[PDB]
């Protein structure tokens, strides 16, 4: 049933987070979900929630699976050149669980467990899921009118699909998105026949794409995902959004090689101009911590328009309160926080350094619990929170909240 | 009015000491003290004025006081009193020559800087000297035996006191200060040991408060021959259990001021068991986690006193947990309160200004360390600091009348006196 499926993929995204190099950066998850459920918002019988995750790994690919769980390298977004681009291997991705194509190839079918390692080799940079001529064929009719629907450009499907073949046609060994998703000429033509018969539309990518792309190739460095100042230099000369995004981008590497003087005016004139703004305001806490000006960046936090509706901000005011020596201002806002997003491992870890500072070991080790829960090892998630229930009294409120709590993660444990 | 003018003559000289004299502001050892003092006073006879009795950092042992009621000890009185009622017979002494007005009845016969510099130069490690009369002597010993009596401690320890001063005026080359200020011929002597003869025979023990306050101002403000020995440390480790723990609290301390905090924690901790709610170790117990940055647990430790309402004690060690642990304004709410209801200590004004520091009041901040300067004589510098804090806030507004108003009396305080 819906159930199941919704289960088995927390299950696969439980054993992804475990092992997978997930990038867990509050203003890259919120805003690959926030641009990925804007296409949700548009499709058609969806019945799942969706999530979208962010691995780092240099090889361009994606894919789903069930619980409409969807998986993207950070590889795209050196690939796309906009954002409609981008958008545009989302919505493929989409309409695959939409039509439950992997679904159905699970259904003709140790059977969990082998495609769970499939999917495990897929993510890891270092026996692979492959999708047919029309299950591709209906990946893009569908996704390319999730795409319209949801204001971007239609061409962008087949510029990208034109640009990834161009590029891909003579190797002997193309990139793995083209290993799952097989891009013949039969269907880069059909695609570029379905975006010239619907209207054009010029759009211009978000400012949040632009920085998005580059903190992932700045921050989250490694192998051919650099930042090369090739194109910082390129975006100098472009439009107005990608100027900034340009000096947002070496005011990041410059707070990456410690040069935190150099940061703080490289990162001075786009703090002027937008200072309610998540992307510089959690550049400029990590400067100002960087040199123990935790204060600082308490203050300007604490001012923020949206503090107390960002996520991103409510992270960062908290760690500044921790770097700050503040624990309780500090665990007073994980404590909602934590309980606000369930999911998020970044919570749970700072609300486990609150707990420990503050010295309330329980709470610590219940805290502990849920980053280990959410990252596939349940058994030691259980552990912890044995011990926690051991530190409060028999029949106490607590230690039916953590006898509670082991018995749900011990029940998950029996499904599979 | 003589009492007026006294009060304020000695509230002169007191601010001159704290701005200038190394005294031991200390919670627990400045309230023992005047605990002790004021239980002799209590006792004593045509007591006209408040009185405040104050703790200096110096080795060499002397006793003095003044106008208002204000007497000054020497942290060396705790290297020579072996038991309570020696130290309680100094501080009688010295009450009585108050009561009889000993020195304001010498100085009927420029000259209000005189006497303050002579009584610094008696304070300050640094040594113009006062000495009274050998009938004011004897007076102070007669009336002084009588109040010690009356209140509980033991007659016998005067002249006991005034014999081991003696010992200590021919087998040493140094003649002690003390017997300068207050010379001892042997017929005071003599005088002192036929009162006490005829006096009931009384054996009193040292309250467990003095060898704690012994060992805290020999131990944590140690300072030349003012030590806490390990001969005497082992020598407590003998006597009554009272002079155990005591002995116990001492190498806690000093495992402390070491900074072996973790040897410190362990030794505090059978004391603490058996006693968990008086302050002597409830203060070491926050000082060694704050060492380690456990703000939190001594903060727990001390919601769960029982006096924290009455004990300043309690109050100001909860205040700095709370700063510490980086809730200022919990420390504030404290501090606000104490401030009012002990306005002339300085150590809870110090903490307001953390906390309002802390809090970017920065008015409230310069107000709050305009009181401590003001405390220490330094009102010009309190009017400097009021004067940016009165320059901070709307003109008509009650923070800017305030502020003003405090400048205004802290002048009237200024032209009393050149
Ligand atoms: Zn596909
Ligand atoms: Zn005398």
Known sequence: SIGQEMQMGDYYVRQLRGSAPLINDPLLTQYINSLGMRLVSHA???????????????????????????????????????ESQLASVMAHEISHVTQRHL?????????????????????????????????????????????????????AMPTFLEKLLDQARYSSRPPE?????????????????????????????????????????????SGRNQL????????????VRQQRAAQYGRALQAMEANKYDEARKTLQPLLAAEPGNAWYLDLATDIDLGQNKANEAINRLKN????????????????????????????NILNRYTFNNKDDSNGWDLLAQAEA?????????????????????????????????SQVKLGSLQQARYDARIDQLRQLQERF
Do not use: C
Request: proline content about 4%.
């Open 44 to 82: 058609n019988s969806v019945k799942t929630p969706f999530h979208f995750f962010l691995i780092n790994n240099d090889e361009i690919n994606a894919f789903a699976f069930f619980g409409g769980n969807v998986v993207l390298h950070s590889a795209l977004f050196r690939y796309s050149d906009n």
């Open 103 to 155: 679904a159905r190839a699970m259904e003709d079918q140790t059977w969990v467990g082998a495609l769970g390692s499939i999917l495990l080799a897929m993510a890891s940079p270092q026996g692979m899921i492959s999708f047919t001529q029309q299950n591709e064929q209906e990946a893009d009719r569908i996704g390319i009118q999730v795409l319209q629907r949801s204001g971007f450009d239609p061409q």
């Open 177 to 221: 998105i083209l290993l799952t998703h097989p891009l013949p000429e039969s269907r880069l033509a059909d695609a570029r026949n379905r975006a010239n018969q619907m209207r054009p539309m010029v759009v211009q990518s978000s400012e949040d794409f632009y920085l998005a792309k580059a903190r992932t190739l700045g921050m989250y460095n």
């Open 228 to 239: 090369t100042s090739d194109l910082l230099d390129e975006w100098a000369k472009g439009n």
């Open 304 to 331: 923020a328009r949206d503090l107390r509706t960002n996520p991103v901000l409510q992270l960062n005011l908290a760690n500044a309160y921790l770097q700050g020596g503040q624990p309780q201002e500090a665990a």
């Open 357 to 389: 500072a503050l010295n309330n070991r329980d709470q610590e080790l219940a805290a502990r619990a849920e980053g280990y829960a959410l990252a596939g090892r349940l058994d030691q998630a259980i552990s912890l929170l044995s011990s926690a229930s």
